[PDB]
Design a protein around this motif. Structure first.
Motif, PDB file in Angstrom:
ATOM      1  N   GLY A 157       0.794  -1.221   0.000  1.00 15.72           N
ATOM      2  CA  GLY A 157       0.000   0.000   0.000  1.00 15.72           C
ATOM      3  C   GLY A 157       0.822   1.264   0.000  1.00 15.72           C
ATOM      4  N   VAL A 158       1.924   1.272   0.753  1.00 13.57           N
ATOM      5  CA  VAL A 158       2.823   2.409   0.779  1.00 13.57           C
ATOM      6  C   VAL A 158       3.408   2.666  -0.613  1.00 13.57           C
ATOM      7  N   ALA A 159       3.852   1.587  -1.286  1.00 12.78           N
ATOM      8  CA  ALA A 159       4.340   1.716  -2.585  1.00 12.78           C
ATOM      9  C   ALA A 159       3.256   2.079  -3.605  1.00 12.78           C
ATOM     10  N   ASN A 160       2.046   1.561  -3.419  1.00 11.64           N
ATOM     11  CA  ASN A 160       0.947   1.916  -4.293  1.00 11.64           C
ATOM     12  C   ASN A 160       0.656   3.423  -4.157  1.00 11.64           C
ATOM     13  N   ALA A 161       0.697   3.922  -2.919  1.00 10.02           N
ATOM     14  CA  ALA A 161       0.442   5.363  -2.650  1.00 10.02           C
ATOM     15  C   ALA A 161       1.483   6.266  -3.304  1.00 10.02           C
ATOM     16  N   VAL A 162       2.749   5.854  -3.287  1.00 11.26           N
ATOM     17  CA  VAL A 162       3.760   6.498  -4.055  1.00 11.26           C
ATOM     18  C   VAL A 162       3.416   6.464  -5.542  1.00 11.26           C
ATOM     19  N   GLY A 163       2.969   5.299  -6.058  1.00 14.08           N
ATOM     20  CA  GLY A 163       2.558   5.203  -7.419  1.00 14.08           C
ATOM     21  C   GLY A 163       1.404   6.124  -7.799  1.00 14.08           C
ATOM     22  N   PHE A 164       0.403   6.233  -6.912  1.00  7.99           N
ATOM     23  CA  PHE A 164      -0.697   7.129  -7.171  1.00  7.99           C
ATOM     24  C   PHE A 164      -0.186   8.576  -7.239  1.00  7.99           C
ATOM     25  N   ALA A 165       0.776   8.910  -6.415  1.00  4.03           N
ATOM     26  CA  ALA A 165       1.310  10.271  -6.370  1.00  4.03           C
ATOM     27  C   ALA A 165       2.131  10.562  -7.650  1.00  4.03           C
ATOM     28  N   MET A 166       2.901   9.574  -8.133  1.00  7.75           N
ATOM     29  CA  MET A 166       3.639   9.703  -9.392  1.00  7.75           C
ATOM     30  C   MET A 166       2.702   9.779 -10.559  1.00  7.75           C
ATOM     31  N   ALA A 167       1.637   8.962 -10.548  1.00  6.71           N
ATOM     32  CA  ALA A 167       0.627   8.937 -11.586  1.00  6.71           C
ATOM     33  C   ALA A 167      -0.108  10.301 -11.635  1.00  6.71           C
ATOM     34  N   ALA A 168      -0.316  10.878 -10.459  1.00  4.99           N
ATOM     35  CA  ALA A 168      -0.982  12.190 -10.337  1.00  4.99           C
ATOM     36  C   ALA A 168      -0.059  13.250 -10.900  1.00  4.99           C
ATOM     37  N   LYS A 169       1.234  13.128 -10.633  1.00  6.00           N
ATOM     38  CA  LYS A 169       2.179  14.097 -11.222  1.00  6.00           C
ATOM     39  C   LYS A 169       2.231  14.038 -12.745  1.00  6.00           C
ATOM     40  N   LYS A 170       2.188  12.807 -13.310  1.00  9.33           N
ATOM     41  CA  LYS A 170       2.075  12.652 -14.709  1.00  9.33           C
ATOM     42  C   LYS A 170       0.763  13.167 -15.344  1.00  9.33           C
ATOM     43  N   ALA A 171      -0.348  12.851 -14.686  1.00  9.11           N
ATOM     44  CA  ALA A 171      -1.678  13.305 -15.081  1.00  9.11           C
ATOM     45  C   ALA A 171      -1.691  14.876 -15.109  1.00  9.11           C
ATOM     46  N   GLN A 172      -1.053  15.497 -14.133  1.00  9.79           N
ATOM     47  CA  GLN A 172      -0.906  16.964 -14.118  1.00  9.79           C
ATOM     48  C   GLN A 172      -0.050  17.470 -15.260  1.00  9.79           C
ATOM     49  N   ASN A 173       1.023  16.755 -15.582  1.00 10.11           N
ATOM     50  CA  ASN A 173       1.838  17.082 -16.761  1.00 10.11           C
ATOM     51  C   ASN A 173       1.009  17.044 -18.059  1.00 10.11           C
ATOM     52  N   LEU A 174       0.135  16.043 -18.217  1.00 10.61           N
ATOM     53  CA  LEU A 174      -0.663  15.903 -19.385  1.00 10.61           C
ATOM     54  C   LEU A 174      -1.849  16.863 -19.446  1.00 10.61           C
ATOM     55  N   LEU A 175      -2.534  17.051 -18.323  1.00 11.07           N
ATOM     56  CA  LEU A 175      -3.889  17.639 -18.349  1.00 11.07           C
ATOM     57  C   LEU A 175      -3.904  19.052 -17.736  1.00 11.07           C
ATOM     58  N   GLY A 176      -2.856  19.400 -16.983  1.00  9.12           N
ATOM     59  CA  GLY A 176      -2.682  20.703 -16.366  1.00  9.12           C
ATOM     60  C   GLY A 176      -3.062  20.732 -14.904  1.00  9.12           C
ATOM     61  N   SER A 177      -2.478  21.656 -14.149  1.00 10.95           N
ATOM     62  CA  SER A 177      -2.789  21.788 -12.738  1.00 10.95           C
ATOM     63  C   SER A 177      -4.175  22.362 -12.458  1.00 10.95           C
TER      64      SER A 177
END
Ligand SMILES: Cc1ncc(C[n+]2csc(CCOP(=O)(O)OP(=O)(O)O)c2C)c(N)n1
Ligand SMILES: Cc1ncc(C[n+]2csc(CCOP(=O)(O)OP(=O)(O)O)c2C)c(N)n1
Ligand SMILES: [Ca+2]
Ligand SMILES: [Ca+2]
Lengths: 632, 632
Positions: B119-139
């Motif tokens: 879960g800790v690693a998944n949460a890191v993944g969600f945070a990285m995925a969110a950073k990527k999603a922000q790169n694509l779609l904007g803040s």
């Protein structure tokens, strides 16, 4: 000890390593070249006897970056171990003594390495094993160091943090970890993937941390002197240049894992004062200096043997080195219904009582795995080791206990979490060490915890792994016989054990547990044979009784160890496996098709519910199995 | 927001959780009681819509200590998710919506947890995925938090250090990790196994660290406000008492994993002002306050949808949510001899180009696995993710990418080191997510690196794992067809790929890759059928040609996916598997006995040598296989 001799020694190591990689057209020259100055200085500090690599109080050296094998082999050769120059010239060749990563069949190699992180954890294990050996035998007899060389890859792996946590907790002031910090990995700059404050990381885990230039001989020596005096586990952060000495390849990721090339080696030799036109050259001064380890180690071992002769612990060491497994009186579980975790826990206690070197522990699951060695105390004074929630490092630690020389270790967790330690279990198998794996909670019988906690595929994995017996006893008596084989075997074993109560079996009719599979019920002209292991054996006994009431003669085979059954002769297998053979196991065990015409297993993940509800849902009932067997 | 309402809310959560565990007579009441004050305050900060758990910009909540499921379910019920009070009363029962550990089939559950650390690693993944999603779609469109609750067990696991390393490197200032520090584990005091300076550990990995009393509402709230403003990933160390509120069981390891007992619950309710004689009670004020999430989340999602309507990224989001796999023009590898790592790398590049959400990376082995997405840049701006030497956290991270909502992730390493990430692969399988596993260097063909680097048992493991297709393509064309199935499948897939060059196949004669096994050569009245996968298919083609020259009619079957073949109807399998069927694979693959009379595999570990030398040693030659087939 002066700069000119150290430089010549380090360059001897460099060019042996480079020449070996080049002749093989395969291997890793970067780390060897980067590490050559450190190992040259370390050779002055290492206490070892090349003519007796089993000397119990030797310093233990581990190359966690096993890809640096050519350097290790160069050093073993030069120091006087039973590894020849011709052996070096057969680096990476079929059947040589110098395989691509180190193997314990090469004398001088303390533990097999290669999978990154393992060596760091093994080195922690050697240091814990040394602390225990000192508890048993006294500080007059055990007082050595454990040196580990590691790289970036090792320290990025989770297992390295797990093991180093334990090293700080246990105040392992016999452990010196030397980190080759060269800023390079296969993908290039280590900064692409890693930027921790490594000193702060290790200080948080209770280490003293020294930081050096790994190509400065005086600094290396000073760090080793200070490390050897530490009251903590010590980390030496050694800044190096990968492929140091190799000109245009210095600092290049291309040097990690491919030959430097003939011309690069020539130029390198020129710059170092070596003749570029000769390979596998050992200068006289270096040869004499490295091989002085033979005289010096002979003298240190002789001094130690004199201390042993005076010791009150002489007889104890003899028992540790020559355990008598045949004398052990195991519990008698005949006719007793029990969970096999409970039978197994009783057996663990009997072994711990009979065998002064038998010890181990669980990854925070002592009370559930039933592995507490009652009244035998906590490590280091006692035998119970509290590994924490660190399955992988537990197994790599216990691999090292098993190599230390006087210990018989066990590692315990739930069978589902065997997956967390499987890479280290594989190393136990590769080395053929005596390390015992205790895996409870073996099936959907776990019940309510649900599918993340219910093994399905793990039996297939452990069966498929070579050099590894996988016992799944159906009752306490099988559990005992399994131990008796495991202690006498030349390979590691796992014990796959139930949470739930199982029914005691009647006596064998033909064969026994040592044959892997044997008969519990045998009928003339059998139409069916029901073959099962562990918790599914009683289902089969009951189903066979129903089949007999309907007029079908049946054999029932208990198979507590697949791998042993695979080794039986054809006449034996033929007597067991009569008629249409149906295998029955709460696992997804397609391997049973080796012995069965039909397999009645589990093909999906499990479900959260009461154990009886889940078993019924997945078809483990006499009515359902009988309908399957009768094809309707 | 005042103490009286927060106390009532937290105690509502406590007693729902306690009552659920008690009714089931199974489960974990300690963590729920310990965490109830934190989650009560956190409910005021969490941005989510209970009526739309797919809202892309929701805060993501992960319970890494999945044994705390009863608390999660209590909260989902109270907040207005599609989980009823009756569902709570069927905690841990077969087929309920409230299984013992959380599963994504329960709406509101972000990711399956249970195996500690994931879960800790998944949460890191969600945070990285969110950073990527922000790169694509904007803040303007992506600006949410990722909250993870974890315990001692999580932070002892290696995977937690691996993932947290990456979180610090990537400056994940959207990630808030809340550590339940209660000093208790199953073996009792956490001090038996762990004494790190946790604040120093995390600071070393680039976190801001706050330290609180987890039963003080004002301190919890203040920490969350400060965490939400952090410029770093943030860790909140929350000191709690396990089973807080449960009287004689407070602080007891006995509360971890068994019911509190009826009388303990009665006393607890008395002390909190609840009626001891009623179960599953939800006070009015708490009910209204928790369920306000429905109105508030509806309004926040509406506001977001308005921002989406104004965005230049509307069309992109639609493509991310509805990828068109059928449009993709794959490379044509017909008649081209290649290593399947190389064909696969080309395919990865084609997918990355066609699919804006397709991304991934290797665990430091990009250049060897052939996974670089050329010219597509490095994360976060680009698509190549540099995981470091962190196989386990890579897979758990990518599990979360696959759950985020817009991504198609791949994880890559050598097939031998699949063992390091297998527990996370299992979670991909359990959830039936689209996450692709790239495993190169698939056999003894690896050669010189030797037996620690040569897979043997890993094919058996992945085949045995449910919900997981394991493709082992024999050429580039099979590799393409494998991808085409994998993208359309409802389960994850692994691709098992060669280091060495393989020979291109001729066209299918009957069936194709989608059938799992198919015919390459078909003879009337076949005496033998040679069945192989991957690198062993050409051996079989050649051996079948020699058998034909000696007068034996042969079928040759290519089996790029065992699991697909298991699903074919009997008429199809019967047409392929004619005469005496011999399976041939460079693996210890007893599962092939499901389809073969004889299996010509590898039963030991490998050897370090040249690939051609090692294959010959292990019997992979036309002369040897033909002699085996002819039994002499
Ligand atoms: C568990 C594991 N994953 C991957 C590998 C492959 N591998 C060998 S060395 C290496 C990079 C290690 O770098 P370092 O440890 O930094 O090596 P050095 O290049 O500096 O020689 C990798 C990924 C491995 N041996 N073990
Ligand atoms: C990888 C893994 N190993 C073991 C377990 C079994 N387990 C569940 S919780 C627990 C102790 C965890 O303690 P904490 O995380 O401290 O739990 P809390 O008791 O405080 O509720 C263990 C060993 C697991 N779920 N996953
Ligand atoms: Ca490095
Ligand atoms: Ca705890």
């Amino acid at each position: 000890m002066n700069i000119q001799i150290l430089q010549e020694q380090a360059n001897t190591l460099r060019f042996l390593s480079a020449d070996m990689v080049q002749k093989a057209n395969s291997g890793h020259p970067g780390a060897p070249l980067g590490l050559a100055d450190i190992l040259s200085v370390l050779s002055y500090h290492l206490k070892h006897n090349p003519k007796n690599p089993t000397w119990l109080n030797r310093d233990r050296l581990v190359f966690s970056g096993g890809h640096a094998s050519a350097l290790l082999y160069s050093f073993l050769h030069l120091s006087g171990y039973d590894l020849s120059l011709e052996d070096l010239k057969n680096f990476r060749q079929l059947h040589s003594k110098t395989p691509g990563h180190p193997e314990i069949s090469t004398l001088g190699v303390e533990i097999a390495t290669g999978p990154l992180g393992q060596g760091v954890a093994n080195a922690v294990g050697f240091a814990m094993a040394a602390k225990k050996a000192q508890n048993l035998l006294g500080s007059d007899l055990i007082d050595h160091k454990i040196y580990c060389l590691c790289g970036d890859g090792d320290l990025q792996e989770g297992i390295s943090y797990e093991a180093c946590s334990l090293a700080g907790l246990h105040k392992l002031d016999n452990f010196i970890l030397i980190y080759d910090s060269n800023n390079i990995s296969i993908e290039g700059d280590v900064g692409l993937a890693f930027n921790e404050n490594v000193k702060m990381r290790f200080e948080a885990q209770g280490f003293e941390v020294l930081s050096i230039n790994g190509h400065d001989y005086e600094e290396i020596n000073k760090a080793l002197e200070q490390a050897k005096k530490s009251t903590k586990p010590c980390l030496i952060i050694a800044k190096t240049t990968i492929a140091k000495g190799a000109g245009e390849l210095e600092g290049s990721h291309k040097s990690h894992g491919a030959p430097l090339g003939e011309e690069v080696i020539k130029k390198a030799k020129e710059q170092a004062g070596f003749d570029p036109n000769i390979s596998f050259h050992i200068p006289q001064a270096s040869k004499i200096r490295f091989e002085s380890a033979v005289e010096l180690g002979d003298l240190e071992e002789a001094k130690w043997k004199d201390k042993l002769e005076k010791s009150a612990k002489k007889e104890l060491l003899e028992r540790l080195l020559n355990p008598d497994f045949n004398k052990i009186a195991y519990p008698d579980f005949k006719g007793k219904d029990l969970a096999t975790r409970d039978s197994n826990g009783e057996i663990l206690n009997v072994l711990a009582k009979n065998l002064e070197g038998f010890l181990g522990g669980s990854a925070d699951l002592g009370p559930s795995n039933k592995t507490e060695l009652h009244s035998m105390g906590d490590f280091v004074e006692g035998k119970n080791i509290h590994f924490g929630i660190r399955e992988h490092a537990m197994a790599a630690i216990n691999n090292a206990f098993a190599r230390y020389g006087i210990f018989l270790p066990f590692s315990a967790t739930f069978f589902i979490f065997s997956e967390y330690l499987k890479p280290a279990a594989r190393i136990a198998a590769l080395m053929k060490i005596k390390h015992f794996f205790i895996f409870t909670h073996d099936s959907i019988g776990v019940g309510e915890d649900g599918p993340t906690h219910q093994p399905i595929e793990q039996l297939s994995t452990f069966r498929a792994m070579p050099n590894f017996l996988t016992f799944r006893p159906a009752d306490g008596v099988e559990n005992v016989k399994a131990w008796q084989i495991a202690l006498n075997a030349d390979i590691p074993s796992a014990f796959v054990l139930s949470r739930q109560k199982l029914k005691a079996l009647n006596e064998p009719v033909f064969g026994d547990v040592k044959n892997g599979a044997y008969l519990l019920k045998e009928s003339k002209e059998a139409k069916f044979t029901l073959l099962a292991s562990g918790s599914e054996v009683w289902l089969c006994l009951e189903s066979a009784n129903e089949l007999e009431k309907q007029g079908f003669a049946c054999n029932v085979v208990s198979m507590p160890c697949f791998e042993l059954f695979e080794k039986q002769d054809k006449a034996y297998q033929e007597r067991l496996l009569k008629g249409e053979v149906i295998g029955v196991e709460a696992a997804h065990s397609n391997e049973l098709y080796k012995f069965c015409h039909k397999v009645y297993g589990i093909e999906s993940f499990g479900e959260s519910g009461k154990d009886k509800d889940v078993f019924e849902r997945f078809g483990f009932s006499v009515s359902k199995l009988v309908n399957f067997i009768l094809s309707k």
